[PDB]
Symmetry: D2
């Protein structure tokens, strides 16, 4: 009962809050989802197909947390709106982690109309839709957290991911304009922008080409290595909790130094 | 080291989107005054007649290509048409769509329209123009950005996000083609007196004066002509060691 | 993935400069609450007695090293003294000097004093501490910066410039020692209620309320305790893939 | 007499203005000084020892411009104040190019008290002093331009130049706080920040080690080359003239892409 101000549970604890984490079936979203549940949030997991989140759900339950799934392809018109509405019908959504994204590599000469539109639909379109449904609901409850997963490419882009990088820049810009609008309602939005992280998106290459991969990562960033998904978790807990009550519209870069 | 030797554009050709009026018009006349042949552009045929007349009157040369940049493939068609007239050395990406709306009033149609013009036609123009510039081993893109690309206000939620994506494209392509002398940079204005705000300005001058007084450190809106020096710098040999960057002309902000 | 497993500091030792009160005091108590042994610091012996008492009262451990960081070599002496007590794993560079003055009222003495504390002692502490941390293959520096390091106001002309230099040191050293797991980052607050502004605040509450209302997007000053989560993040395993960066806690700005 | 608005001479012309360019005996300062005189400014040249600016002065004169020298070591206390006062006794100083700087390479472990203090004295100390004397004088005349020469190291520093980089960050911060104060008086301050440029500071290395140097510059920046001093000139003319009338407190980075 005394000196409560300074405890980890007071600062980062999420008991009584609910988080929706898009693309939490695996990778960074899965790590973040487990971390959030670890701090006490009830977590609504999401993936494209029904049942894709089963393994993460069971890890959350086995660690004494609670979680359930909502599935859906975010490339579909209105999908972001519908996801929020379904999540809200389960419980008030206090925390939204915008993690699922589309990425098709191509330099400008290889960028097709289809690929550009798909990456916009998922990365910008569904983001606009989810914020449009979720933010008024958080504003009405006077508390909200959006943790948008961005990328070092939002700030220093490489043409190998031309379109994706451009959608990540637009996405953070949304986080900024809305943070400015709703800060006074305790509805805060920030971006967590990773550099290179070991996930499925590169699982195959690592396994098939260790020599190359190591020479590449060695001069990519100051640590000379890829990050692990679990290394995103602290920053996500910070951005999802009372701990960031005086921070909004900002980006935390986790790039291994870059 | 005469001004002409630093910023001169004799022998170059520039395409300036949205050069019928406002910032694009001032830029077009500046480029033509530095010696560029200028291809002017606006939505409808004849929209650029006045700027063309002023360029010719001052001893420069110019002609018009019109087209609505919101239509699918319009950027590609525009560059192809301009290239059939002459090598396009300098591309000024100035025309843009802006529909004011906070997030609650942002419709999918309005979002799609702003994307089509601000990002869609930009991608299409660069996809067509950059390879031509690279083969010639010289090129300049001057993308007209906005302070909202960096510190956005929700009153232009969608437009601000498109300007952030557009500058990101400028950076990724700058990084690819710098070794070919094909340079891309953003000129990002703060508030500038144009038609886009003539209506507010005419309509509540006190409300307006009071908003500009505290907007930026100079307490005023910029004039389209104050964009021109910067455009000349980014369009010429002068910026030969500069690429992927942004010049902010915001009155101090 | 318990909070304790992510942010826990059992077995680590932290030195927090200027932990007698304000932001440094809150940070010290937070670190001690996460399990760090904390070495507290203030200008004069006994200045940190209260924070030490609260740490011990909540089950943590702490002790004091005092010293004026404006004196030549003081940063070096401070680190050497702390290292003779235990390995210093975490260095929080919080104490700073701030003498308000616009450029016309900036004296060479005031400039030298702010440089000596804000940059001089920082260089000396890092010069002494970093090699020790590197040899142990783990280290954290949490430099307390300021929004003025990035968007300065002339009312703190000299102080703002020192905070910009200090963050630059953080970045150059981060880049050198990242491969050794010795990480350095800046926590940069906007306006926070401390003693440094208790006097204004007590003295013209309307003038004050009116200035904070429009200062940042939340329209309020932060509390020292709102710095603590961020300090814990930057002081622990949690920031293992983050270095050379800045966390801005400004209320939105 | 018609369409004057759009001419190069109107936009960038400096007839009737006077510029003081520190460290203009050679390198970037010399190129900038000649460019300014080329646009019509009367240029006060500066170097450490009397007569160090003689060759640049004669190039300026031979091209039909005017220039004269003021010499002095900026590491001395009060040197910046005294330089401005001497320049003002020649003519009102409309344009100040803060180009001379001290640079002694050292990582943190090799940084000595003497070297740190010297680099502060020149890069920060004399900068504070010159701005302190010059700005009120420009404010009284309702027109002024400060073009501060910074460095890519002000933003992304390398430890090989630890102290220097830190002084360049502080220096740009001064440019910002003062720009904000005096914008309303048409007294504008901006930073021109070069990346790697061929000057005397590396003249010896280039000449003695061409193979190494070329491999190094090839992956340094996106152009794969060092800049030339004359490539700073356009940006300096822009920042010194009517052309930047709506720009203050900003940095132009000339780094070859970085
Ligand atoms: N990995 C990196 O190096 C890296 C670096 C910087 C930024 N990031 C960003 O971090 C976030 C997560 O990356 P990651 O590497 O963890 O991705 P990942 O492992 O490939 O997983 C992506 C997740 O998003 C979901 N998803 C993908 N496409 C979708 C669609 N059209 N509709 C709905 N859901 C979809 C997937 O669901 P299913 O499991 O059902 O397919 C999956 O759960 C992304 O925003 C990414 O841009 C990653
Ligand atoms: N004004 C400001 O305060 C401000 C601030 C920051 C950034 N900017 C940026 O500066 C640039 C120019 O702005 P401005 O205020 O000078 O604009 P403006 O006065 O409204 O003129 C816009 C120009 O773009 C053309 N245009 C508009 N929509 C088009 C479409 N769908 N297809 C083809 N052409 C189209 C117009 O052609 P028609 O004449 O045929 O209609 C006109 O020539 C824009 O990129 C804007 O975003 C402006
Ligand atoms: N408060 C704000 O609004 C704000 C905003 C942005 C950044 N910051 C930064 O946050 C940090 C802490 O600020 P604060 O407002 O909490 O400060 P504060 O309440 O004034 O406390 C300052 C602490 O630093 C110590 N200190 C001051 N001068 C010293 C010297 N010459 N030698 C040794 N120790 C010295 C003091 O020791 P004694 O108790 O012995 O005097 C005290 O413990 C500073 O780096 C400040 O620049 C503050
Ligand atoms: N070269 C690069 O790659 C590079 C990159 C980024 C930034 N910069 C910056 O650009 C500016 C010019 O660089 P540079 O390479 O042209 O330098 P430089 O060729 O070595 O010449 C420096 C000039 O400054 C003067 N100077 C040096 N120390 C001085 C002192 N203590 N007091 C008074 N004057 C002094 C010198 O006068 P004397 O001739 O009498 O010695 C000389 O005219 C500097 O601010 C530098 O930091 C350069």
């Amino acid at each position: 009962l005394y000196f409560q101000s300074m405890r980890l549970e007071t600062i980062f604890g999420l008991r009584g809050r609910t988080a929706l984490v898009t693309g939490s079936s695996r990778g960074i979203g899965a790590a973040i989802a487990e971390g959030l549940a670890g701090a006490g949030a009830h977590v609504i997991l999401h993936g494209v197909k029904p049942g894709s989140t089963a393994a993460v759900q069971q890890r959350i339950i086995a660690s004494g947390g609670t979680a359930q799934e909502l599935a859906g392809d975010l490339s579909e018109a209105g999908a972001g709106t519908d996801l929020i509405e379904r999540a809200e019908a389960i419980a008030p959504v206090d925390i939204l982690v915008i993690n699922a994204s589309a990425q098709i590599n191509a330099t400008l000469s290889a960028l097709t109309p289809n690929d550009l539109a798909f990456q916009l639909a998922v990365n910008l379109g569904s983001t606009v839709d989810m914020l449009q449904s979720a933010l008024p609901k958080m504003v009405a409850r006077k508390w909200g957290r959006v943790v948008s997963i961005g990328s070092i490419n939002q700030l220093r882009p490489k043409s190998v991911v031309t379109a994706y990088a451009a959608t990540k820049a637009a996405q953070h810009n949304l986080i900024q304009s809305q943070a400015r609008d709703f800060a006074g309602d305790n509805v805060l939005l920030n971006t967590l922008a990773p550099g290179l992280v070991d996930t499925d998106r590169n699982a195959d290459r690592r396994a098939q080409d260790p020599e190359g991969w190591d020479e590449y990562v060695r001069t990519l960033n100051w640590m000379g290595r890829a990050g692990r998904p679990e290394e995103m978790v602290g920053a996500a807990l910070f951005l999802a909790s009372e701990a960031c009550s005086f921070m909004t519209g900002e980006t935390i870069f986790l790039t291994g130094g870059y």
